[PDB]
Every structure is written in structure tokens, then in C-alpha cells.
């Protein structure tokens, strides 16, 4: 579908730069532009205006064309700007940390969300794409807490253009390799946030990289029961352990000893 | 010691920016400045004119004040009008010698083991004086007239830029640790064994630390990679050194040997 540049301008209040907490329209910055909240019809949307070019814009509609799925954020139209379905429960990161007073997701909800996201990735790999920026601030959540994977701003194969989010990137990606096995790794870190509710990196914490607690647990310096998010009363040891063992595997260092995303679909489905 | 700025201008030929290989005095660029070849008072020196704060100029004179060791490059003096003067190392970097640059002969296996052992002693001294080198590559390891090893030069959505060829993973992730110095040492040992450069854009694999994986999966063996420009490399000790290289390059930093153990493993090798 196609939108008017005049329309988008006025339903976002001439691109009101103020944060929505203040009463403006600025939902965030990312994906190589700023994201404003808009009202088209009697429905809310996400309007992205681009900023540090045309190359990045035409590609986003190329990748969005092939890949539409229940657990990917659906594009609606274009214009220079872009338009997405609006996810009013925000990022999984916002929810895992109860940003702004929201109540802690239950274990059941978290399990549904993992399974959900993992279907998103399986769809991208089925259709031979690599996300290259899987992280919990790019897993958005709609009115039903369905997982919707956002920011496709990056969607042997080498490169001198190394990019991603270092707290989440796998070792082979840090060096420049582009492979689906890297998305599994990053997805492994997203699982550890869901189990623990802790950030993937924290300057004032030991270990600073969440992905390091895995070593602490192999060396039996700790047990999973020590990192489990305590802001939740329906988690059972059995299925928590089972999810961890999946996180752990996505986290192997040798890219070929990692599970493909279809085997993650099973291990998580077999978890309920 | 202390020097005169205008005499360093004279002994380096007005600081001839041109490289040595064409008649100038520039030996290289590093350590936040350029590095020229000077001569003063019966001593060939290396002069590093700092470029574009001053706390920096006195903060390296701090470190170099304590760190004097058989295997570190020794500081001779300074000048604040801003330059540092070093003992010249007539055989250049280990990298230059591994690649037989300018037509020098290939270091023997036996020489390579001494050099290896050497640099680990320098690295061990630096870790005992609680110091993180952060840049162990085979071109920051210089060689004196005896081929003694002398070590020198010491998270939102983003993009990495550092020379991936030597940094460990956790370093590329922004951790700063001695365990990262060991990783880089590991790649040095593979350069030493193979004579190949740590990265080569027109080779598969590109990164030389990638061959470890290639060897583990049994697609190859360490023999397939041994520097042909040796005549004395016996299989046993080559595999021995590969074994240290292998442990050094362990992907999770706390599984890697501490530097004191690399010294041991390297010693038992002769």
C-alpha cells in the first residue's frame, strides 16, 4: 500500500519531536530514522522518517515484500517515510524490566513470547534472510502480547561493514561473518533476559555481559535458580530448566554446534 | 635522560616523513605519533614525535619508568619542546622477519622458539607489573642484533572498527583484560608456525585464527600449514607449540592459560 507525504505529516502533528510521555509523537530512534506515532483511519500506526540514503529505503521494502508472518511486524505503506502496524505494549525489553510501572510478565506469557519470536526467525531463515540485530528491544509486543520482530535495518560470507549490538553478537559476527547461525546466538541472549529479567549488558554488575552467566553455571559457581527472575510466581523449575538448556545451546561458541531455528522451534514447543 | 628538540630535528633529518625504503627516516606510525630513525652520540635511536593532552606524554614515561626487562623495548629519554627516544632494534619486527621482508633469510625453527619464549617473558613481566598491553601483534614485537625478542607499544546499536585479526571476542565486545593479551599471543604463535599473516583478504580463511577450527574438525592438520621456509622444524615440537597456540585461542577467556603457564608450556618444549 501507498501513503501521502502530506497525510503522514499531519497525523503525527508535523512530526512532533516530543516524547509520548510528554504528549508528543516521538516513540523512539532507530532503524535509520525517527519513529513517530500516527493515526490513519481510526487506527494507530508507526511512522518512520529516515535520517542518518535512498539505498536503505528501497531495500526495506524488498525484504518486507517476501517476509510477512504472524510474528513479524507488518509494514502497511510508504512515501521520505515508512509505515508499520502499531504495537502498543512496546518492546520485550520494556516489559521484562517493568518500565513505567507495567506488571511483570508471567512465566506462561514469557514462554508464549519465546515460542512466538522463534517462529519469526524460523520464517526469515525459511525465506533465506538474516536479521543481524535480534535483541529484546526489537521484539515488539501487540495488544495480545504476540511477538512481533521489528527493526529490519540490517536485513562463508564476509564483510568490512561489521554491525549489530555487541552485547548480543556472536563471536563469528564480531569478526564480520554473516550467517543465520549468528541469529540463533543472539536469540540465546534474548532467552536469558526472559529467564532472568536482567539486561544483556550492565556496566555496574559482575558479570557485565549477561551471556557470561552461562559460564558461571557450567563451572557450578552458580545454579539457574540463582538467576531466575523473581518478579513472577508461576515459573516451575522443570520448564525453566528446559528453556535454559535451549538458551545454552544457542550459545555454543562453535557456530556449527548450534541448533538451527527449526530445532529451537521444537525444543520450545516440547517445553509445553 | 633528557634531549633537545632541535637536535632530534637534526639527527632525524628534519624528521624526514618519507619511509626508510626510499631514503627518509620514518620507520612506522604507532603509539599516537610517528617514529623516526635517529643517530646521536654513538647510539642509533628511534624517535617518536607525538601528534594530534600532555598528561599522555608523561604517562608513558611513568609506565616505562618501572617496566625495564630483558624483553621490553627500553626507553632512553624524552624531550618536551613532544618526543620519546627508544633503543633501536636493528632487525625490525617479527612480522617483517616472518615474511622475509627485503630479502632477509627465513628464521629457523630453533630461532623461532627462542623468540616465542622471549616475548612470553616480556608479556609475563607486564602482567606481573599489573599491565594490559592491549595490542600484542607480531609487529609490535621487535628484534635486536641478537634476535632477542623486544616487545613494544604499551554497546547500543553500533559498528566495530578495530583490527579483528588479533583481538579476542570479549575485547571486540569491549572487555579490557589480561586474558585478551593471551589470545593475541595465540595468533602470534600461528604466524610463527605458518609464516602466514594474521589476516589476508584474498585467502580462505581470511583470518589466520580460523585455521584452528579447520584443524579441530579434521578438515586439515597442523602439518598442512607449517612454514615451508624452515628446514629444522621437527613435527613433535611444532605440534607442541600448536598446542599452546590452541589453548591460548580458547573462545571463553577463563579457559585460556594464564601467561605464567604459557611460559612453562613453552619452556618444556625445548
Swiss-Prot record, chain A:
GO biological process: cytokine-mediated signaling pathway; innate immune response; interleukin-1-mediated signaling pathway; interleukin-33-mediated signaling pathway; intracellular signal transduction; JNK cascade; lipopolysaccharide-mediated signaling pathway; MyD88-dependent toll-like receptor signaling pathway
Name used for this protein in its record: Interleukin-1 receptor-associated kinase 4
Enzyme Commission code(s) on record: 2.7.11.1
Biological role: Serine/threonine-protein kinase that plays a critical role in initiating innate immune response against foreign pathogens. Involved in Toll-like receptor (TLR) and IL-1R signaling pathways. Is rapidly recruited by MYD88 to the receptor-signaling complex upon TLR activation to form the Myddosome together with IRAK2. Phosphorylates initially IRAK1, thus stimulating the kinase activity and intensive autophosphorylation of IRAK1. Phosphorylates E3 ubiquitin ligases Pellino proteins (PELI1, PELI2 and PELI3) to promote pellino-mediated polyubiquitination of IRAK1.
Signal sequence annotation: none
Disease (UniProt): Immunodeficiency 67: An autosomal recessive primary immunodeficiency characterized by recurrent, life-threatening systemic and invasive bacterial infections beginning in infancy or early childhood.
Residues of the full protein shown: 166 to 458 of 460
Assembly behavior: Associates with MYD88 and IRAK2 to form a ternary complex called the Myddosome. Once phosphorylated, IRAK4 dissociates from the receptor complex and then associates with the TNF receptor-associated factor 6 (TRAF6), IRAK1, and PELI1; this intermediate complex is required for subsequent NF-kappa-B activation. Direct binding of SMAD6 to PELI1 prevents complex formation and hence negatively regulates IL1R-TLR signaling and eventually NF-kappa-B-mediated gene expression. Interacts with IL1RL1. Interacts (when phosphorylated) with IRAK1. May interact (when phosphorylated) with IRAK3.
Catalytic site positions: 133 (proton acceptor)
Annotated ranges, domain Protein kinase: 21-268
Localization in the cell: Cytoplasm
Record-level Gene Ontology MF annotations: ATP binding; interleukin-1 receptor binding; kinase activity; magnesium ion binding; protein kinase binding; protein serine kinase activity; protein serine/threonine kinase activity
Cofactor: Mg(2+)
This protein's UniProt keywords: Acetylation, ATP-binding, Cytoplasm, Disease variant, Immunity, Innate immunity, Kinase, Magnesium, Nucleotide-binding, Phosphoprotein, Serine/threonine-protein kinase, Transferase
Organism: Homo sapiens
Entry superkingdom: Eukaryota
Swiss-Prot record, chain B:
Residue positions where Phosphoserine is found in the record: 158
Major localisation: cytoplasm
Domain Protein kinase: 21-266
Coiled-coil segments on the chain, per record: none
Catalysis: reaction(s): L-seryl-[protein] + ATP = O-phospho-L-seryl-[protein] + ADP + H(+); L-threonyl-[protein] + ATP = O-phospho-L-threonyl-[protein] + ADP + H(+)
PTMs per UniProt: Phosphorylated.
UniProt entry keywords in alphabetical sequence: Acetylation, ATP-binding, Cytoplasm, Disease variant, Immunity, Innate immunity, Kinase, Magnesium, Nucleotide-binding, Phosphoprotein, Serine/threonine-protein kinase, Transferase
Residues reported to bind ATP: 27-35, 48, 137-140, 153
Location of this chain's protein in the cell: Cytoplasm
The keyword Kinase belongs to this UniProt entry's keyword annotation: yes
Catalytic residues identified in the record: 135
Positions of post-translational Phosphothreonine modification: 157
Alphabetical GO biological process terms: cytokine-mediated signaling pathway; innate immune response; interleukin-1-mediated signaling pathway; interleukin-33-mediated signaling pathway; intracellular signal transduction; JNK cascade; lipopolysaccharide-mediated signaling pathway; MyD88-dependent toll-like receptor signaling pathway
Top EC class of this enzyme: transferase
Keyword Phosphoprotein annotated: yes
Cofactor: Mg(2+)
GO cellular component, one term: cytoplasm
Entry's Gene Ontology molecular function annotations: ATP binding; interleukin-1 receptor binding; kinase activity; magnesium ion binding; protein kinase binding; protein serine kinase activity; protein serine/threonine kinase activity
EC number in record: 2.7.11.1
Effect upon mutating residue 48 to A: Loss of kinase activity
Family: Belongs to the protein kinase superfamily. TKL Ser/Thr protein kinase family. Pelle subfamily.
Complex and partners: Associates with MYD88 and IRAK2 to form a ternary complex called the Myddosome. Once phosphorylated, IRAK4 dissociates from the receptor complex and then associates with the TNF receptor-associated factor 6 (TRAF6), IRAK1, and PELI1; this intermediate complex is required for subsequent NF-kappa-B activation. Direct binding of SMAD6 to PELI1 prevents complex formation and hence negatively regulates IL1R-TLR signaling and eventually NF-kappa-B-mediated gene expression. Interacts with IL1RL1. Interacts (when phosphorylated) with IRAK1. May interact (when phosphorylated) with IRAK3.
Involvement in disorder: Immunodeficiency 67: An autosomal recessive primary immunodeficiency characterized by recurrent, life-threatening systemic and invasive bacterial infections beginning in infancy or early childhood.
Role according to the record: Serine/threonine-protein kinase that plays a critical role in initiating innate immune response against foreign pathogens. Involved in Toll-like receptor (TLR) and IL-1R signaling pathways. Is rapidly recruited by MYD88 to the receptor-signaling complex upon TLR activation to form the Myddosome together with IRAK2. Phosphorylates initially IRAK1, thus stimulating the kinase activity and intensive autophosphorylation of IRAK1. Phosphorylates E3 ubiquitin ligases Pellino proteins (PELI1, PELI2 and PELI3) to promote pellino-mediated polyubiquitination of IRAK1.
Protein name, per record: Interleukin-1 receptor-associated kinase 4
Organism: Homo sapiens (Human)
Residues of the full protein shown: 166 to 458 of 460
Amino acid at each position: 500500500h501507498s501513503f501521502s507525504f502530506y497525510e503522514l505529516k499531519n497525523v503525527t502533528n508535523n512530526f512532533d519531536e516530543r516524547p509520548i510521555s510528554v504528549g508528543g509523537n516521538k516513540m523512539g530512534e532507530g532503524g535509520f530514522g525517527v519513529v513517530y506515532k500516527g493515526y490513519v483511519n481510526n487506527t494507530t500506526v508507526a511512522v518512520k522518517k529516515l535520517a542518518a540514503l535512498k539505498q536503505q529505503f528501497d531495500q526495506e521494502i524488498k525484504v518486507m515484500a517476501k517476509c510477512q508472518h504472524e510474528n513479524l511486524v507488518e509494514l502497511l505503506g510508504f512515501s521520505l517515510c515508512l509505515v508499520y502496524v502499531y504495537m502498543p505494549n512496546g518492546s520485550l525489553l520494556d516489559r521484562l524490566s517493568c518500565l513505567d510501572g507495567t506488571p511483570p510478565l508471567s512465566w506462561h506469557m514469557r514462554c508464549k513470547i519465546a515460542q512466538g519470536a522463534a517462529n519469526g526467525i524460523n520464517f526469515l531463515h525459511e525465506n533465506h534472510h538474516i536479521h543481524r540485530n535480534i535483541k529484546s528491544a526489537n521484539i515488539l509486543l501487540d495488544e495480545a502480547f504476540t511477538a512481533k520482530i521489528s527493526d529490519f535495518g540490517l536485513a562463508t560470507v564476509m564483510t568490512s561493514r561489521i554491525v549489530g549490538t555487541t552485547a548480543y553478537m556472536a563471536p563469528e559476527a564480531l569478526r564480520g561473518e554473516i550467517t543465520p547461525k549468528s541469529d540463533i546466538y543472539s536469540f540465546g541472549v534474548v532467552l536469558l533476559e526472559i529467564i532472568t529479567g536482567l539486561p544483556a549488558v550492565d556496566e555496574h554488575r559482575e558479570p557485565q555481559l549477561l551471556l557470561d552467566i552461562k559460564e558461571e553455571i557450567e563451572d557450578e559457581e552458580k545454579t539457574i535458580e540463582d538467576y531466575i527472575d523473581k518478579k513472577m510466581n508461576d515459573a516451575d523449575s522443570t520448564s525453566v530448566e528446559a528453556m535454559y538448556s535451549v538458551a545454552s545451546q544457542c550459545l555454543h561458541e562453535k557456530k556449527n554446534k548450534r541448533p538451527d531455528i527449526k530445532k529451537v522451534q521444537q525444543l520450545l514447543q516440547e517445553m509445553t
